Amino acid sequence: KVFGRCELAAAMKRHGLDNYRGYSLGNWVCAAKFESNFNTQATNRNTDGSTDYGILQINSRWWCNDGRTPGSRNLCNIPCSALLSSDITASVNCAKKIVSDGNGMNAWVAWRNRCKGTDVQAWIRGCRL
Ligand SMILES: [Cl-]
Ligand SMILES: [Cl-]
Ligand SMILES: [Cl-]
DSSP states (O other): OBOOHHHHHHHHHHTTOTTBTTBOHHHHHHHHHHHHTTBTTOEEEOTTSOEEETTTTEETTTSOBOSOSTTOOOTTOSBGGGGGSSSTHHHHHHHHHHHTSSSGGGGSHHHHHHTTTSOGGGGGTTOOO
């Protein structure tokens, strides 16, 4: 599924991301835009042979099992393919574990480089929430 901006903001709010570990909703919408272009089916392979999955580009080295990343962890206890679903539940639940890990949203490269320090409220402007 390719979400619209305000449709994803509403889905993220329903799933408890607004202000989760102090990150306002616009931070999560910005991260999703730049990680996946709001596409739940996005995948990208990394140099190390791990792969990033779904709307928040969660990595198989640590967070999910894809059967092809040797010596990796599965800290979210899920197949990586669950992160591709039109239902964002699994991605959100995993994202909550990641953001609690000690580096906050800095775990997401695109957030650090493209959202951090910007007017992230723009991402939710106009939306009925
Ligand atoms: Cl915000
Ligand atoms: Cl893994
Ligand atoms: Cl933090």
